[PDB]
Amino acid sequence: AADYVLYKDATKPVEDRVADLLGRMTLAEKIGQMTQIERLVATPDVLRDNFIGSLLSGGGSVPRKGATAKEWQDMVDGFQKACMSTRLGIPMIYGIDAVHGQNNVYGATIFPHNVGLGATRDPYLVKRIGEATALEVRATGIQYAFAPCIAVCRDPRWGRCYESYSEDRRIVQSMTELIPGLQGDVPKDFTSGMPFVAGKNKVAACAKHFVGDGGTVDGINANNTIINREGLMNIHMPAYKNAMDKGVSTVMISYSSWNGVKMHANQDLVTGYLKDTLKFKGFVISDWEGIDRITTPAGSDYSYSVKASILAGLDMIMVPNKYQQFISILTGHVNGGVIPMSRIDDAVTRILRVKFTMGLFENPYADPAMAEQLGKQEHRDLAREAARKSLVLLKNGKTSTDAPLLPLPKKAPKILVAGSHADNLGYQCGGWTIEWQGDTGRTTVGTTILEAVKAAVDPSTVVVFAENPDAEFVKSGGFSYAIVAVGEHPYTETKGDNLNLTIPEPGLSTVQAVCGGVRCATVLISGRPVVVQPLLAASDALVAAWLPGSEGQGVTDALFGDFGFTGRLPRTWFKSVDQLPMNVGDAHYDPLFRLGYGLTTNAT
Ligand SMILES: *[C@@H]1O[C@H](CO)[C@@H](O)[C@H](O)[C@H]1NC(C)=O
Ligand SMILES: *[C@@H]1O[C@H](CO)[C@@H](O)[C@H](O)[C@H]1NC(C)=O
Numbered sequence: 001a002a003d004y005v006l007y008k009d010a011t012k013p014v015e016d017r018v019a020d021l022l023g024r025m026t027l028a029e030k031i032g033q034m035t036q037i038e039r040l041v042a043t044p045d046v047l048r049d050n051f052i053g054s055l056l057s058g059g060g061s062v063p064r065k066g067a068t069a070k071e072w073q074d075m076v077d078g079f080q081k082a083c084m085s086t087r088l089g090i091p092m093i094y095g096i097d098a099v100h101g102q103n104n105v106y107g108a109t110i111f112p113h114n115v116g117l118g119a120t121r122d123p124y125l126v127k128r129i130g131e132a133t134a135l136e137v138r139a140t141g142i143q144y145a146f147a148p149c150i151a152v153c154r155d156p157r158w159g160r161c162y163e164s165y166s167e168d169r170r171i172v173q174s175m176t177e178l179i180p181g182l183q184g185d186v187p188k189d190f191t192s193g194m195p196f197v198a199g200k201n202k203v204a205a206c207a208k209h210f211v212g213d214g215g216t217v218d219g220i221n222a223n224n225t226i227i228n229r230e231g232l233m234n235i236h237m238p239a240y241k242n243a244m245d246k247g248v249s250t251v252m253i254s255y256s257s258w259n260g261v262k263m264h265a266n267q268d269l270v271t272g273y274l275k276d277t278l279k280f281k282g283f284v285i286s287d288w289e290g291i292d293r294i295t296t297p298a299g300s301d302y303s304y305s306v307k308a309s310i311l312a313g314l315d316m317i318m319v320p321n322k323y324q325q326f327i328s329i330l331t332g333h334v335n336g337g338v339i340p341m342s343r344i345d346d347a348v349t350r351i352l353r354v355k356f357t358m359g360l361f362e363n364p365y366a367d368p369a370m371a372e373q374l375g376k377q378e379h380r381d382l383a384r385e386a387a388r389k390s391l392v393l394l395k396n397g398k399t400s401t402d403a404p405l406l407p408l409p410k411k412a413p414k415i416l417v418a419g420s421h422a423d424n425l426g427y428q429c430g431g432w433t434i435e436w437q438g439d440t441g442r443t444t445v446g447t448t449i450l451e452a453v454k455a456a457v458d459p460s461t462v463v464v465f466a467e468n469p470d471a472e473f474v475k476s477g478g479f480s481y482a483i484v485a486v487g488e489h490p491y492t493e494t495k496g497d498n499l500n501l502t503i504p505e506p507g508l509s510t511v512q513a514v515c516g517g518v519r520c521a522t523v524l525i526s527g528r529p530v531v532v533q534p535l536l537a538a539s540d541a542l543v544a545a546w547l548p549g550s551e552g553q554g555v556t557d558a559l560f561g562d563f564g565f566t567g568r569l570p571r572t573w574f575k576s577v578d579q580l581p582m583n584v585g586d587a588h589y590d591p592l593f594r595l596g597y598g599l600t601t602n603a604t
């Protein structure tokens with residue numbers, strides 16, 4: 001008709017649609033695209049009136065506890081309907097931290113955290129996990145995942161070290177395969193730096209956090225990374241170029257500083273390097289109150305935060321609450337000439353480029369036939385395979401002449417499963433699982449270590465559970481062997497920053513009591529290397545299981561010899577925290593276990 005609007009015509013080239021829509025937009029409509037808000041402050045009027053571009057769920061931001069996939073779809077579609085009702089009918093994009101599966105959602109498959117995936121040295125397995133995670137995120141109506149974290153964690157005292165595949169940038173680079181899993185494979189022609197998402201069964205990805213998040217002093221989270229440019233480029237930057245080659249749609253900026261310059265205010269790196277040198281053409285998003293945190297105290301000159309960030313080259317702001325103040329301030333700056341219209345139009349071009357490329361104008365709403373992808377058994381099988389491949393066997397016998405303890409026999413008259421982490425699903429998942437910080441106990445659907453033991457063993461095997469048994473209990477029990485599981489409690493971000501890296505009690509004391517009475521395999525649950533010589537000295541066998549997720553059977557698959565141990569350390573294991581930082585390749589390199597170490601077993 002001559003009611004035709006070029007931007008709404010799905011047969012037209014993305015760039016022509018972007019230009020067409022951009023040319024029609026008011027300032028308010030443009031700045032609205034640049035604003036991401038929390039679901040917690042969203043309403044239909046707020047979305048319509050402020051022309052909002054994006055919404056997110058932060059860690060723990062859910063419609064309710066226990067919500068079904070359908071509840072999520074209906075929430076997301078309620079917000080979209082309001083956005084589609086604007087004058088221009090620009091669909092919002094909804095983001096979430098789906099960083100080891102669709103991990104805020106009850107019943108979602110929970111994969112091993114990144115450090116364990118690094119142990120697999122299996123980029124294809126990580127691609128398959130991206131694929132499955134895309135399906136589980138679209139199950140809930142969500143179109144955008146804030147992953148992967150491509151930090152290169154150079155000191156395990158950092159609370160986010162588990163979100164890093166490896167201290168070795170080459171392993172992190174290999175694991176950028178998550179990207180084309182989440183988003184689809186890019187076409188043969190593809191230009192490096194262009195955004196890509198295949199369509200409605202994939203999600204937009206986010207390479208985070210740009211750049212040097214893993215390089216901070218003493219592993220202090222969100223702190224300063226002191227390193228010359230050569231080292232920034234040799235260690236922290238290279239996986240970002242792999243991400244551009246694979247069409248990553250967005251990039252999130254780090255809270256951290258580089259030689260004292262806040263990343264959220266770094267024009268040279270965000271615009272000079274990422275955009276102008278790597279030729280990134282997707283959108284750049286802030287972290288959560290990242291612009292606020294440019295100043296100290298945070299939020300003490302929000303006007304400056306806005307100016308600095310948007311001049312630096314950020315495109316979309318994760319406000320996420322004070323939207324009215326953000327929009328008002330940015331509007332003032334453009335009205336005054338402080339921020340030119342060229343900058344606004346660039347940010348909006350990039351946001352719209354991602355939205356059109358990914359099909360969001362053609363499929364703004366959820367597909368209810370996708371809901372049943374959540375927690376699907378084929379995905380649990382994949383997570384079980386990833387958990388097993390992530391395990392690193394550190395010791396299997398106290399002397400070189402002992403019978404190797406693992407693999408254990410499935411038939412025995414009576415066995416003991418013990419420890420604070422043997423029957424606790426939340427501990428085995430760690431942080432970013434249902435809550436931001438994670439949680440304790442049966443927080444979602446899965447199989448604990450105890451549960452997996454009872455599922456694996458011969459029917460005649462009697463399984464006894466005791467969380468913290470004393471030495472007498474064990475010696476009197478008539479046990480053939482024991483499986484004892486201990487380690488770190490869940491943590492995320494600054495909460496996990498830890499200068500001592502010693503596991504909480506009772507952990508060691510239980511291992512001591514158990515191993516002192518019966519031959520024992522110790523399963524260590526952690527986000528990183530921790531002080532381990534005492535646990536080793538007590539144990540016949542010891543496994544570094546990292547944070548393996550919902551599928552505890554991956555642990556028993558290897559314990560009982562269904563598969564051999566194959567994982568290798570993706571990080572150095574230190575002897576003492578006084579050595580840190582200490583990485584493969586330094587001068588004073590004196591590891592307990594070097595990067596790449598891992599004992600093997602043969603199946604059956
Ligand atoms: C690093 O942390 C120190 C110690 O708390 C703090 O005072 C300093 O401002 C931080 N620096 C950053 C975040 O750049
Ligand atoms: C070791 O660090 C953790 C968290 O930072 C703390 O819970 C534990 O009690 C610490 N002990 C110290 C700093 O002496």
Ligand SMILES: *[C@@H]1O[C@H](CO)[C@@H](O)[C@H](O)[C@H]1NC(C)=O
Nearest residue numbers: 404406407564600601602603
């Ligand atoms: C596993 O197989 C390889 C040879 O195929 C051998 O080197 C290793 O020692 C074997 N261990 C056992 C228990 O068979």
Ligand SMILES: OC[C@H]1O[C@@H](O)[C@H](O)[C@@H](O)[C@@H]1O
Nearest residue numbers: 057058059060061097288436
């Ligand atoms: O209060 C918890 C919230 O605080 C923020 O700092 C976290 O990043 C969000 O992901 C989370 O929803």
Ligand SMILES: OC[C@H]1O[C@@H](O)[C@H](O)[C@@H](O)[C@@H]1O
Nearest residue numbers: 057058059097146208287288
């Ligand atoms: O949940 C939103 C954001 O919260 C921030 O605290 C984290 O640093 C990001 O990794 C995360 O995507």
